[PDB]
Design an enzyme around this catalytic site. Structure first.
Site, PDB file in Angstrom:
ATOM      1  N   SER A 278       0.799  -1.220   0.000  1.00 25.42           N
ATOM      2  CA  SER A 278       0.000   0.000   0.000  1.00 25.42           C
ATOM      3  C   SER A 278       0.834   1.274   0.000  1.00 25.42           C
ATOM      4  CB  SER A 278      -0.912   0.071   1.231  1.00 25.42           C
ATOM      5  OG  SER A 278      -1.975  -0.850   1.135  1.00 25.42           O
TER       6      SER A 278
ATOM      7  N   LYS B  72       0.277   4.275  -2.292  1.00 26.24           N
ATOM      8  CA  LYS B  72      -0.844   5.205  -2.145  1.00 26.24           C
ATOM      9  C   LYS B  72      -0.383   6.605  -1.748  1.00 26.24           C
ATOM     10  CE  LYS B  72      -3.852   1.333  -0.963  1.00 26.24           C
ATOM     11  NZ  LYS B  72      -4.231   0.386   0.110  1.00 26.24           N
TER      12      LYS B  72
ATOM     13  N   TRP C  89     -10.921  -3.913   2.918  1.00 26.52           N
ATOM     14  CA  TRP C  89     -10.181  -2.840   3.587  1.00 26.52           C
ATOM     15  C   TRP C  89     -10.369  -1.502   2.865  1.00 26.52           C
ATOM     16  CZ3 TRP C  89      -9.384  -2.318   8.310  1.00 26.52           C
ATOM     17  CH2 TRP C  89      -8.691  -1.197   8.779  1.00 26.52           C
TER      18      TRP C  89
ATOM     19  N   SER D  79      -5.044   3.744   4.281  1.00 26.69           N
ATOM     20  CA  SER D  79      -4.739   2.760   3.241  1.00 26.69           C
ATOM     21  C   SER D  79      -6.000   2.266   2.531  1.00 26.69           C
ATOM     22  CB  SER D  79      -3.931   1.587   3.788  1.00 26.69           C
ATOM     23  OG  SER D  79      -2.605   1.980   4.059  1.00 26.69           O
TER      24      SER D  79
ATOM     25  N   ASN E 225      -8.562   1.007   0.164  1.00 27.08           N
ATOM     26  CA  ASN E 225      -8.337   0.378  -1.139  1.00 27.08           C
ATOM     27  C   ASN E 225      -9.312   0.857  -2.214  1.00 27.08           C
ATOM     28  OD1 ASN E 225      -6.024  -1.343  -0.895  1.00 27.08           O
ATOM     29  ND2 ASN E 225      -7.231  -2.577   0.514  1.00 27.08           N
TER      30      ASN E 225
ATOM     31  N   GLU F  96      -4.495  -7.136  -6.172  1.00 26.13           N
ATOM     32  CA  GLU F  96      -3.546  -8.040  -6.819  1.00 26.13           C
ATOM     33  C   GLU F  96      -2.095  -7.594  -6.651  1.00 26.13           C
ATOM     34  OE1 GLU F  96      -6.446  -7.023  -8.244  1.00 26.13           O
ATOM     35  OE2 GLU F  96      -7.442  -8.892  -8.845  1.00 26.13           O
TER      36      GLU F  96
ATOM     37  N   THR G 184       2.441   3.715   5.243  1.00 29.97           N
ATOM     38  CA  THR G 184       2.761   2.310   5.436  1.00 29.97           C
ATOM     39  C   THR G 184       2.371   1.460   4.221  1.00 29.97           C
ATOM     40  OG1 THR G 184       0.614   1.907   6.467  1.00 29.97           O
ATOM     41  CG2 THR G 184       2.420   2.498   7.927  1.00 29.97           C
TER      42      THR G 184
ATOM     43  N   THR H 239       1.570  -3.011   3.758  1.00 27.47           N
ATOM     44  CA  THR H 239       1.536  -4.362   4.308  1.00 27.47           C
ATOM     45  C   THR H 239       0.935  -5.281   3.251  1.00 27.47           C
ATOM     46  OG1 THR H 239       1.164  -3.384   6.483  1.00 27.47           O
ATOM     47  CG2 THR H 239       0.877  -5.761   6.246  1.00 27.47           C
TER      48      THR H 239
HETATM   49  B1  LIG Z   1      -1.965  -2.275   1.081  1.00 27.91           B
HETATM   50  O1  LIG Z   1      -0.638  -2.589   1.822  1.00 27.91           O
HETATM   51  O2  LIG Z   1      -1.871  -2.861  -0.333  1.00 27.91           O
HETATM   52  C1  LIG Z   1      -3.220  -2.959   1.904  1.00 27.91           C
HETATM   53  C2  LIG Z   1      -4.140  -3.843   1.320  1.00 27.91           C
HETATM   54  C3  LIG Z   1      -5.153  -4.423   2.059  1.00 27.91           C
HETATM   55  C4  LIG Z   1      -5.285  -4.129   3.404  1.00 27.91           C
HETATM   56  C5  LIG Z   1      -4.399  -3.257   4.026  1.00 27.91           C
HETATM   57  C6  LIG Z   1      -3.373  -2.674   3.289  1.00 27.91           C
HETATM   58  C7  LIG Z   1      -2.279  -1.880   3.971  1.00 27.91           C
HETATM   59  O3  LIG Z   1      -2.162  -0.582   3.477  1.00 27.91           O
HETATM   60  C8  LIG Z   1      -2.338  -1.873   5.481  1.00 27.91           C
HETATM   61  C9  LIG Z   1      -1.108  -1.100   5.978  1.00 27.91           C
HETATM   62  O4  LIG Z   1      -0.747   0.001   5.370  1.00 27.91           O
HETATM   63  O5  LIG Z   1      -0.500  -1.602   6.910  1.00 27.91           O
END
Ligand code: A1IB7
Ligand code: NA
Length: 267
Positions: free
Chosen positions: A44, A47, A79, A104, A106, A142, A209, A211
């Site tokens: 993420s 972003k 999310w 984050s 989506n 993806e 961040t 993840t």
């Molecule tokens: B992102 O890292 O692609 C993502 C996708 C699904 C759920 C959470 C996230 C993260 O942004 C969470 C994070 O930043 O720790």
């Protein structure tokens, strides 16, 4: 670079994977660098750069940030904690940008990606600021596959830091847009256990961040304003060899501490 060596190798070995760190003292230009030119999945963390690309476009489109965007249930992506609360109303481009950065979100990220012309459009924005490393190839979710050896949806800690500096402190954005990007990063809610955990409470900081959920892959990048000296820009990325390897927020915080120590920034 690395005038003072720090024990990153022991840290990544205890973690069971690889840690990549670049940190720049924007005053003297000194750096700390460890695996800094290796590619790591963005997850993420793209972003943040997405929001910067939106701000760049808003310099030529004065009404862009306040444009209301309506979306259907099919645009929700797992999310999407902010955009799910406004499904029945819509949100502005600026609100989607803040949600993508600070939660984050989506669905917000995919809506803004579409506005910019998709992964290639965000990649083109990064090329336009001189980043030849960054690549976005896929959409949420993806892009989180984090497959070992796969260059899709990756960058390097160094290029992340260099681009972050250009956008938050340099001239890549006009001054109002630059401060807006900083303010969105400062308001992030997802990073309290990552770089922020290494940053004293009396310093300003913004971060984004990432993840991926697999391959021990997670990250954070930040601009930090220690009082009385020039700001520090840094990126900390991790990955690990096995799909079910867990990420660690503590490892990211610990690497950030080592980076600040290597720069001689008392924290
Ligand atoms: B992102 O890292 O692609 C993502 C996708 C699904 C759920 C959470 C996230 C993260 O942004 C969470 C994070 O930043 O720790
Ligand atoms: Na590696």
């Amino acid at each position: 670079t690395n005038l003072v060596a720090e024990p990153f190798a022991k840290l990544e070995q205890d973690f069971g994977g690889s840690i990549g760190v670049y940190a720049m003292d924007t005053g003297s230009g000194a750096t700390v660098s460890y695996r800094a030119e290796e590619r790591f999945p963005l997850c993420s963390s793209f972003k943040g750069f997405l929001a910067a690309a939106v701000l760049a476009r808003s310099q030529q489109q004065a009404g862009l940030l306040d444009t209301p965007i309506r979306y259907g249930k099919n645009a929700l992506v797992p999310w999407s904690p902010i955009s799910e609360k406004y499904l029945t109303t819509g949100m502005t481009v600026a609100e989607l940008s803040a949600a993508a950065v600070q939660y984050s979100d989506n669905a917000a990220a995919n809506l803004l990606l579409k506005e910019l012309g998709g992964p290639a459009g965000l990649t083109a924005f990064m090329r336009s600021i001189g980043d030849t490393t960054f690549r976005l190839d896929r959409w949420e979710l993806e892009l989180n596959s984090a497959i070992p050896g796969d260059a899709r949806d990756t960058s390097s800690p160094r290029a992340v830091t260099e681009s972050l500096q250009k956008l938050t402190l340099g001239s890549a954005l006009a001054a109002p847009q630059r401060q807006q990007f900083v303010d969105w990063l400062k308001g992030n809610t997802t990073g309290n256990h990552r770089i922020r955990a290494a940053v004293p409470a009396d310093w300003a900081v913004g971060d984004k961040t990432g993840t991926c959920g697999v391959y021990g892959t997670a990250n954070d990048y930040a601009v930090v304003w220690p009082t009385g000296r020039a700001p520090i820009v840094l990126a900390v990325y991790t990955r690990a060899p096995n799909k079910d390897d867990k990420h660690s927020e503590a490892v990211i915080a610990a690497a950030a501490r080592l980076a600040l120590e290597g720069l001689g920034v008392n924290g």
